[PDB]
Amino acid sequence: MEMEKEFEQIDKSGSWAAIYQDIRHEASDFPSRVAKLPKNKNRNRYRDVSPFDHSRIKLHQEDNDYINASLIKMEEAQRSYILTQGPLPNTVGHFWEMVWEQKSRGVVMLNRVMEKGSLKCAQYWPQKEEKEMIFEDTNLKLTLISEDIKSYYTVRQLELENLTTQETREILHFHYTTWPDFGVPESPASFLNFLFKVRESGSLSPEHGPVVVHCSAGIGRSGTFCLADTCLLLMDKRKDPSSVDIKKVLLEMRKFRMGLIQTADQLRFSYLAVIEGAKFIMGD
């Protein structure tokens, strides 16, 4: 069923809450035993948001390999993503260790450091060129190279140096700065423009490691970003674009990380973003 007609059907009958609860009921339940070990309590922001064991990213260290991060591997679309929580004061070094070890080119951030009067993630990158950051627990140095502030997003160029080997790499930081404190955006236009800027940079392409994407918990706004990107790519690849079923794509992604898409409003907004984005994919 053409999702555009499915959309109007759900909208007129006002059944978004019902559709969303059906997804919650059918979603996968896999173990997350490593996340729940006592030694990892201060590595998790939220007690009820954990990576599954089978898809969790492992740090390359013998001490403690745990980070709250998951590999989402989309086989038909030929895209992979790492979805993670916003870094905590005690996990900023682990976060950049992961970026290095996984050979990522881009980091996508969908939250502000403070929202609703409370801290949603650590200030984990430098704000001035001349004030670099050193992460002594993981032996990395991080420098701000340039910053481009736009009305709806900011793009930063960063240098990450492995201090053990003195290799360096350029990392791109794509920061969507205008998601509202409550609810979802009225129009998907600025979010789609942002997605296309991430695509244009190479950060999602197979010559690099998976993009790292986060918000506060790494499941809501972050799920919206990867769901929209994968659905648009599938409509480009298939003979019949109307065969792309957003609910089936979402359930496939939920095999790899729990809780993706946190509200019925985020589900509706994901539909709207794919519907409006297709009017470029299909040749306009």
Beta-sheet strand order (sheet of 106-109): 56-58, 66-74, 79-84, 211-214, 106-109, 168-176, 153-162, 140-149, 133-135
Query: Which tokens is 23 given?
Result: 């997804």
Angle at 265 between CA 246 and CA 244, to 5 degrees: 10
Strands 106-109 and 140-149: unpaired
> Is residue 102 a known part of a binding site?
no
Which residues touch 33 (CB under 8 Å, ≥6 apart)?
53
Q: Which residues 6+ apart lie within 8 Å of 149 measured at CB?
A: none
CB neighbours of 13 closer than 8 A, spacing ≥ 6? Answer: none
d(CA 207, CA 78): 12
Chain-centroid distance, C-alpha 62 = 27
C-beta separation of 276 from 235 below 8 A: no
Residue 184 makes CB contacts below 8 A (sequence gap 6+) with 265, 266, 268, 269
The reply, when asked if residue 217 is annotated as ligand binding, is yes
User: CA 206, 93, 31, 109 torsion: positive or negative?
Assistant: negative
Q: Which residues are catalytic?
A: 215
Q: Would you say the C-alpha torsion 227, 59, 110, 163 has a positive or negative sign? A: negative
CA distance 34 to 250: 25
- d(Cα 28, Cα 259) in Å, to the nearest integer? 10
Q: How far is 233 from 214, CA to CA, in rounded Å?
A: 21
* Residue 231 marked in a binding site: no
216: nearest Cα among 265, 181, 247, 190: 181
Place of tokens 């973003």: 273
The continuous run of DSSP H or E covering 199 comes out as helix 189-200
Residues in Cβ contact with 191 at an 8 Å cutoff, skipping those fewer than 6 apart: 176, 185, 224, 228, 273
Among 250, 193, 202, 181, CA closest to 3: 250
Residue 157 DSSP SS3: strand
Measured over the CA atoms of residue 31, residue 34, residue 39 and residue 40, the dihedral's sign is: negative
Confirm if 88 and 122 have CB atoms less than 8 A apart.
Answer: yes
Could you give the 3-state DSSP secondary structure of residue 95?
Answer: helix
Tracing tokens 């980091």 back to the chain, one arrives at: 107
Q: Which DSSP state fits 209?
A: B
270 annotated among ligand-binding-site residues: no
* Helices 264-281 and 3-12, axial angle in degrees (round to 10): 150
Q: Three-state DSSP class for 80?
A: strand
The resolution in angstroms reads 1.6
Angle at 210 between CA 229 and CA 265, to 5 degrees: 35
HEC states along 219-273?
A: CCHHHHHHHHHHHHHHHHHCCCHHHCCHHHHHHHHCCCCCCCCCCHHHHHHHHHH
